[PDB]
Amino acid sequence: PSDIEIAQAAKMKPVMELARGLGIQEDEVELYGKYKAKISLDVYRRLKDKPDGKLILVTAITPTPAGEGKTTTSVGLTDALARLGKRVMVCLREPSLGPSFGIKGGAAGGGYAQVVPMEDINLHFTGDIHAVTYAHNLLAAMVDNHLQQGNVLNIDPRTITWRRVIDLNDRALRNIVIGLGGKANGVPRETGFDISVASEVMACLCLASDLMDLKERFSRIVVGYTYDGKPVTAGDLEAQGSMALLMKDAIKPNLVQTLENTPAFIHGGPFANIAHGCNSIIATKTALKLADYVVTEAGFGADLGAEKFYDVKCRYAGFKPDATVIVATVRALKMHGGVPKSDLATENLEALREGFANLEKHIENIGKFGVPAVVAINAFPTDTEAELNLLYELCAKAGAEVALSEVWAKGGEGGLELARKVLQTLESRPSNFHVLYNLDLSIKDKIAKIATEIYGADGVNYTAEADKAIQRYESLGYGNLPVVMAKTQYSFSDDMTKLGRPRNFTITVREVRLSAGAGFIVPITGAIMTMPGLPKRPAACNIDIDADGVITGLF
Amino acid sequence: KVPSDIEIAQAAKMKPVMELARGLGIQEDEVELYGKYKAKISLDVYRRLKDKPDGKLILVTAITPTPAGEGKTTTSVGLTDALARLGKRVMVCLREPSLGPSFGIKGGAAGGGYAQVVPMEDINLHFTGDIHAVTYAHNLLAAMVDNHLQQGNVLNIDPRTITWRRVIDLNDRALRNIVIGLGGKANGVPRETGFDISVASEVMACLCLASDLMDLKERFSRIVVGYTYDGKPVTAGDLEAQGSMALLMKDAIKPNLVQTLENTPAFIHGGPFANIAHGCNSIIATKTALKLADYVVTEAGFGADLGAEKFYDVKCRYAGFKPDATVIVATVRALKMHGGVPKSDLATENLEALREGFANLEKHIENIGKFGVPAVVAINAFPTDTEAELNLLYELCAKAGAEVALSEVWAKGGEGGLELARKVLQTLESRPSNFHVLYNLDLSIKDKIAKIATEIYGADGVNYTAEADKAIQRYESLGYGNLPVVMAKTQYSFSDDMTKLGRPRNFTITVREVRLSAGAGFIVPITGAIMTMPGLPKRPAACNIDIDADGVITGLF
């Protein structure tokens, strides 16, 4: 059937059951209807000394338009592990609302490997993204107001880096002039809007230890500079309290479940380019004390998500990932061997071997962190046996454990093979985890290592702006932070057409922005889209809902 | 004695709302919890109770507002709580406040002292997310307008005539006048526009006047966003936005159950502007109450010239409600302001200035009379009032033929409103109402405007600018001429001059502009300058607001 038909055919257990079965007190649960809830921060605070379960990351090979299925696999693996009688959770990211009205409206996973309720997840859910948005825009309000009231701190409005947010895809608000209409109405200036999920505030929600840490981060944010170049912060404006208060429910992870009633957290949902691409630390760390096994994931390929997962999230949280799955398809692999999307159903053993180079590299890279990999093949109905076997073999020739996953079609039952290979790994392969780089390196040094060790670049080139920008940040003492690489995702390089694995290439860093709040540095290599726009016939036009509450055109 | 408002909210033991739901005859499968102290009730409740008779309906209004405060929500809640003590099956319906104030001027409890609806913190903050949904539907439509320009402008909208602005629920002056669409041909179509505070949104007004979800959708469809180069209106229906907007409001349409400090059940739902709109809580909420209780108390923004008039002439009209009684809140202090006494010396007894400002109150009673609804005055007692002033207030209320009661509900809760409650009940038992609207829809716009201005405001007559005269002809030509009228006027006078206190005579109202709400289904004549988006003060509340590890809040109230 279809993703949505399946969600609706499903039978959901009240979430309080699940809460209780995990050893969550009824006074720590906060229902939003009988199938979603917020879990207090007190749970972690009281289980602070229990041991952490096993931490498992689901990443993948370089994205293609032919599709990977990295979420499907986190949920299916999770549903197999439940069927082997394991005490397991899954942690996932909340999607933006914006797609639902432009292009998609999509399942959190797909087939018989989703998290539910699907409707609520795609609409307002528990309002987490409304609170980010209000927190971001209050700050900007307070900025523009502070100019109006004499601008005591002597900010140069033209230097302001803090923009606005909204969780709709509105190209019209990319570049605006505000502050018009007179001396009563503010100070004219050039600014604009980004999509709310790209908010530094969303990044902070996802890297905070607790509410008081969320507040200190807020206070550290850079909104702009004085006429002399001194930086001004959210704390210079006394914004941090108000913004923390506006997030007091948002900071609590949201408990949901799979089609098969395995417990799931959904919490946070940042960008994976100008930010790190994970769900929150709060949820993953809470899941760790509530389960023996935690399955989580990260955006884009392992060159980006996984690398940041390890180098940002784990570093902050003090997590030691115990294993990592890497997803791949025979379809996707052939594209990396030059086959076009048109011809993906024609068998091509030759193309599959060449395209394998993409996967081979990721495995090596995952190697670099001392985490035991496992390849998981997403089964696809037009894949011939010759192909699959050849893949299986090539992973083994690369010394990698590999499994067939049919979790899309068959649910927890299609994940069993993979689950077993995962369990086989946890018990018998102790992880030797370490960050790829030290924080004391310079900014250029950190970018080199990643660019050379992870992307396979000969080296890195900097523009005059980027050079001047790094020289400034280091001089303000922002130089011993991590680094978050804003690159394309469709290649190891920064050339979207250079399908993996290219050699003899260099990476170029065109701009450098700062996220003092989240606590990192962002090198840009391409033009980055922080606010997408609607297509010619947006989905909104065809969405409807009748008298009986039956919805259409949403999925 | 009396603690702070927030000290009181936290000291009060709330009952799980599910109990309260059941106490009201609501089935488990009609309730949807947001924690154990908030809930959304199904619209199917009203549907299965459609044939039950209605409870009594009791409107709480007030005299002309001042800075110096009135006391209307506090009365609404205290009245409710007294009625509950007297053994009656009663509900109160109120508006959800905007988020914005909490970060500028102050967070205002929903009521005050011992007359509060709770949980306080949640109602002021995100509550059940109704205002966020209103915000997302409004701005989705606006995104859909700009996109339509970008994609070949098939409907031939002239960007420069676009009336549909955007919204956000924060007080941000810098966004009032903006230019968007800049950056090249890939980034939209440059144009002048702006933001308004989310509670001003026609979307909000539509939420508060919809019969149910399919009706709220139809309204949405009728909304006018701009005009073609030829002058033809382009509706949100024309851009097929109404289904999505409705879908974005699927939980927002359900009234939210909560309660008072004394566990009397309560609905908070909807929250519009009382000037460019009607200043009332939702019809959905009010009509459901009327099926689940023998007594329903609700209220309207601003003084009775504005809210009451709109409650009667828009809300009750659309709903088929017939108000059985109406309460008017006055204070001694404010009545002296209306007889000339400035705020600095309001504590000083002054019988002569009190006698003079009573004129304000006198005029409102008369006006309430014009709708066939028996009035009852509620004197909101304040500790510096002398007994001589109070007795002279009671005398003047009798000489003017209105029952009257002292109300000490701020200090003493339900007990402090028993005397008023009993007067209200005397009136329901003995003076059934003769409710009629003020005006027929068939009058012309200028006729309806004149009826309000002369009958209610006390005006000699009404003047128009050339712009207004163009707008009115335009609206009448397009057939929006048999609509109700929603007068955006200052609240601090009967006049449109915010300094003319009391009961001004020999005066004339002037209508500078006229906007249209096709979706909410009314015409809006503007008499002043109208602030649809306030700004923050020199030292905003946000600067002094904090929250520590123990979850303790400060500087929020």
Ligand SMILES: Nc1ncnc2c1ncn2[C@@H]1O[C@H](COP(=O)(O)OP(=O)(O)O)[C@@H](O)[C@H]1O
């Ligand atoms: N009798 C009273 N004593 C002290 N304070 C009062 C009294 N009545 C009202 N207030 C306070 O003064 C303000 C006026 O009452 P409120 O219900 O807030 O006004 P309204 O709803 O009429 O705008 C309120 O914030 C309320 O808390």
